[PDB]
Structure 1
Amino acid sequence: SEITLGKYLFERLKQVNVNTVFGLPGDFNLSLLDKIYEVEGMRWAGNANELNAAYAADGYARIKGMSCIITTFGVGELSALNGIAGSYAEHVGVLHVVGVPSISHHTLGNGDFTVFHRMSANISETTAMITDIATAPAEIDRCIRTTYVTQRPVYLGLPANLVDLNVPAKLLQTPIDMSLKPNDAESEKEVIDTILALVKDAKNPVILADACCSRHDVKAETKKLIDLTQFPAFVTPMGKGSISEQHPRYGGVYVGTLSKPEVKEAVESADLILSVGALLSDKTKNIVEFHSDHMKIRNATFPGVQMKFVLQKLLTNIADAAKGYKPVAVPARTPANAAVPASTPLKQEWMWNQLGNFLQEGDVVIAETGTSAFGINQTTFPNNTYGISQVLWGSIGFTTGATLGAAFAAEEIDPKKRVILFIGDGSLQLTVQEISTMIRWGLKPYLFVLNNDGYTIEKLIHGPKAQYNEIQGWDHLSLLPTFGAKDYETHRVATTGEWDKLTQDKSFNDNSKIRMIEIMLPVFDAPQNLVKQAKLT
């Protein structure tokens, strides 16, 4: 038995639990897409654009562990670049497959077939341009391993001619080894003895779980770490959802000066900060920084020491190192909103506190860069809730695509999980057509649109009335029907009373259909803290 190189890929993909592929068909990927339908459990999303396809793979990747997007030579691959750059910046393993001329139009007129390939080489961990079938399987295996292991995008260029040549089916019987290289014995020992040492001498140690806490596997090792030690644990905004917000040792989200004052202090008064997975913004004492391929203790750098090993080892001796610890109280959780008349115009501060009431365990919460990403940091999540916020890259159309990707993976995990989006009126415009793909597949997300008439976040820092910070007003509610939706629901909310009425409805809380909920907000309204700093800034 043989299999085509093309089916081979989808089969391996399925081995790593990639069931949905993103991208758009083109002149050089057609023969390869045919293969998707010869493998069971696999489906082609049929995205509305390549940039949007890149964004979805990213989101799906964030939920499932990896993703795949197929594009065509030039036109398709160059449109995805901003998505792949953001996956690269934030550590999302996205495998980007591109169909290329037949080892032989959508060219810069110069005869150069490697330009695009070399452009991507800048935002990838590794690149493969496949030219021989005898080497293909290994090559493909290699790109999948890398994407998955490093949680970085890989470019896999695949000529149209080779997708059709046969490869031994036998190859698939041997799984791709995803196991890491051990560390330098002497430096991993150095790091381990030193941490245990710091721990034994710290009176007020704190744990901070960042961005990569969960992408890099360590979410489990991080929760074990909390229980064993009993130190107060905090998430930074990129790590929100990494720690179950209902854990007694859960102390809050640490943003710097934007934090709730009691949170800011609890972290800042700490004599040891244990930091897991920084893409760090962050008096603050001795900081042990844990990164997937390096540690840092204080000012010292141990290049090459992977956190996985250090963390599996620490767990056998931490309870002991720490048995001298006297639990410190954690900052009390922000109290419920005061009762106000139902007429009360919606304000974000009210809203973000208020939202926590709507959320349930297993929710997928996506927040777009704008005042949306700032406000979500104020929402107390139930346990087992995943947060998505593109704080480092910060590409405004991101989330419409992320939501599709995330919904597709949720659907594969448990059709009962909910996908909630919080996106600004201005950002919805960059990537609106992706709502089309959700409808096509019967995905049922909650799309909340912050209608505040333009870009309030840039207005808060420069040109409150600069024409460039305004946009064409859209009739948001007609989006669903314009894109051929069938089973849907739209809603408008402008007051406290309306939020409640709809968010407390039992049918509402059920993901029976795709829904759009327009939120009416004042142009200059944002989370409190952001207005104080923004003003005097």
Structure 2
Amino acid sequence: TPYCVADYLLDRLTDCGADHLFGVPGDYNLQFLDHVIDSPDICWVGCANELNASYAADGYARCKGFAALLTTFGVGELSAMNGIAGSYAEHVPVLHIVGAPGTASQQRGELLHHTLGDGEFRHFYHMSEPITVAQAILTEQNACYEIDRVLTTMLRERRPGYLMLPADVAKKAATPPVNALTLRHAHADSACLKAFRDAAENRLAMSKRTALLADFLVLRHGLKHALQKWVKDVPMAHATMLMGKGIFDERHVGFYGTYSGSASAGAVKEAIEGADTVLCIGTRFTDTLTAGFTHQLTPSQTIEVQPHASRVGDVWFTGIPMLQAIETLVELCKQHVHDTPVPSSQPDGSLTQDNFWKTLQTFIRPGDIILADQGTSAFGAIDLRLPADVNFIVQPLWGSIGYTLAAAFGAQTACPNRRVIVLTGDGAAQLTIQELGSMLRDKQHPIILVLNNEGYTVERAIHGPEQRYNDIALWNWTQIPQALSLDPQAQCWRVSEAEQLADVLEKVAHHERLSLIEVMLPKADIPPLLGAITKALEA
């Protein structure tokens, strides 16, 4: 077994932070899979389908900073395309490796399985172009430097890449690299950085009260600790939006709640929208994050930092790495922001939205990985007051229901020793249910809370509440582990009272087995954030 292109790719995977490879086998990638199995550094994780595999890689990358997905030509890669699209939309670096027919077969235009029957082998490569920052068709003549180019581009942009790996190319001789693949930190031209610094200082020097709004690009580019240390060294009002929730210890002084435009709590609206200057760090003001674009933040009121450019008022400064922009603003805030922010300011009976999130509030602990799906789950979890060291995974920009259950399998794989809490609606869990079987096969011990209100009630709040299209098949949730496993190491409960939920949670606190809690909720009940976003449109 001489070292070959397959091994070089796998060595580069580990360089990038991936210790696992998710996917589904097929004849076009089996021989590559032999190298994954034999590899001492990469562990193959077979998933129940390719869409779930791509979701799981996404959740994995949100825990480890990088992930990789393996599918087979045509039927595999096209099944995973919604996952890669979501990773592109939310800036998640997942590498899509596609095992493909050998080059000679492709050159001959053979009528092969997993093609459109036209002799064409590049349709699917081209269809992946809009949802990747870099891609390559690997050949004997380009393999190792195209592998390095694509991965390096993914590390810089924190976004998916694509590699088509014909089976014959994977076997071609290669040489183990001596140095690990690392992305050299870019540096702005010092005069260009100076221009942004002076403009930022001039604005901050005249600001009576300055607030800090950080969001998900902070997480993606490895800058969480920089922003926590920022607000510890320079106390001031700070918040995230829904996407970046978990950047901050939300018990710390200066944090008043998550910002969601006009849907924000009063203290948040005053802390953020009331400031003369708001530093927007890695922010994207989406419809869901801003309660239908009802945020009140003007250009002259704001300084914003993006991955490659920063803005002060109306002026953009391009070619500035987000790290240097943040370092500059931290120094300037230390100079001009001198504030002591005002400190921030049991449930029983039938389960409601209100007492559910109140009960869950008392249960979460540092170290938790919390994932919530679109619907009442994510928009109720926004009100959770996260303690330190919480990884909060939500997908509100792409917004694909079913992501959460499969992403939790990936996240638990990345962090076997952390407690994983899955908040999914009954509708959302149906789309990716088969993964739960992957969790049980692998003896994972997540806490899965299925918010069962018997249908799609987000939509009901949006439109046609009694329309039959918002109904679903009613499942027997507590019987699913025993159906998707011959011997599940799981325990299931069905709860309808707040105190039953409290007792159950208490019992599974140390997550010795997989837990599935079917949470009985009213059909029309919606969390406060939804009530303002259902109203957000239609004019």
Could you say which TM-score interval applies, normalised by the shorter chain? over 0.9
1:174 aligns with 2:179: yes
Residue by residue over 1:315-344, the C-alpha shift from the partner in whole angstroms, topping out at 9 and shown as x without a partner, is: 44542233xx23231542xxxxxx55x4x1
Tell me which residue corresponds to 2:35.
35
Task: Tell me which of 274, 293, 296 is aligned to 2:311.
Answer: 296
Using the TM superposition, name which of 392-401 and 175-184 deviates more: 175-184
1:130-279 pair list within 5 angstroms: 130-132=138-140, 134-169=141-176, 171=177, 173-279=178-284
**Residues 1:422 and 2:423 aligned together:** yes
1:477 partner SS: helix
Unaligned runs of 5+ in 1: 333-338
Q: 2 CA distance for matches of 1:181 and 1:410?
A: 30
The normalised TM-score by structure 1 is 0.93
Structure 2 counterpart SS, 1:70:
strand
Q: Deviations over 1:43-89 (max 9, x none)?
A: 11110001111111101000000000011111101110000001000
Q: Which residue does the alignment assign to 1:62?
A: 62
Contact 1:24–1:76 under 8 Å retained in 2? yes
Find the aligned partners of 2:445 and 2:536 in 1 and give their Cα distance.
42
Alignment match, 2:325: 310
The structural deviation recorded for 1:7 is 1.6
2: distance between equivalents of 1:283 and 1:42?
47
**Cα deviation 1:110-139 (Å, max 9, x = unaligned):** 12111100000111101110112x532222
Q: Which amino acid aligns with 1:437?
A: S
| 1:82-101 alignment runs, 5 A limit | 82-101=82-101
Q: Is the 8 A contact 2:53 2:80 kept in 1?
A: yes
d(CA) in 2 for partners of 1:401, 1:120: 21
Greater mean alpha carbon deviation, residues 159-168 or residues 74-83: 159-168
Partner of 1:503: 505
Q: Counterpart in 1 of 2:477? A: 476
The whole-number CA distance in structure 2 between the counterparts of 1:346 and 1:512 is 26
Aligned to 1:461: 462
Q: Please report how far the alpha carbon of residue 504 of structure 1 lies from its aligned counterpart in structure 2 after TM superposition.
A: 2.7
Q: Could you tell me how far apart the structure 1 residues matched to 2:114 and 2:28 are?
A: 11
Q: Is the contact between residue 204 and residue 328 of structure 1 (CA under 8 Å) also seen in structure 2? A: no
Output the amino acid matched with 2:9. L
The aligned counterpart of 1:328 is 341
Aligned pair 1:48/2:48, yes or no? yes
Q: 1:447 to 1:54 in 2, by over 3 A?
A: same
CA RMSD for the aligned pairs? 1.7
Q: Output the CA distance in 2 between the equivalents of 1:26 and 1:355.
A: 42
Q: Residue 310 of structure 2 aligns to a residue in which SS?
A: strand
What TM-score results when the alignment is normalised by the length of structure 2? 0.93
Shift of 1:246: 2.0
- In structure 2, distance between residues paired with 1:354 and 1:209: 27
1:266 and 1:331 in contact (8 A); partners too: no
Matched, 1:114 2:122: yes
- Cα separation, partners in 2 of 1:17 and 1:349, compared to 1, 3 Å: same
Match in the other structure for 2:297: 284
Matched residues in 1 for 2:86 and 2:296: separation? 32
Give the partner amino acid of 1:295: S
In 1: Cα distance, 2:532 partner to 2:225 partner: 38
Contact map agreement 1:7 1:38 (CA 8 A) in 2: no
Secondary structure of residue in 2 paired with 1:478 = helix
Distance (whole Å) between structure 1 residues aligned to residue 313 and residue 57 of structure 2: 37
- Counterpart Cα distance in 1 of 2:442 and 2:533: 43
What is the aligned length?
Answer: 518
Residue 289 of structure 2 corresponds to which residue in structure 1?
none
Partner in structure 2 of residue 335 of structure 1: none
**DSSP 3-state at the match of 2:3:** strand
The alpha-carbon distance between structure 1 residues 316 and 208, as it changes in their structure 2 partners (threshold 3 A), is closer
Residue pair 1:202, 1:271 contacting (<8 A) in 2 also: yes
* Consecutive unaligned residues in structure 2, runs of 5 or more: 106-112, 287-294
Quote the offset at 1:195 in angstroms: 1.5
Secondary structure at 2:46 match in 1: coil
- Paired letter, 1:375: G
Secondary structure at the residue paired with 2:80?
Answer: helix
Task: State the shift of 1:186 in Å.
Answer: 2.7
Structure 1 CA distance for aligned equivalents of residues 6 and 533 of structure 2? 54
Aligned twin of 2:448 = 447
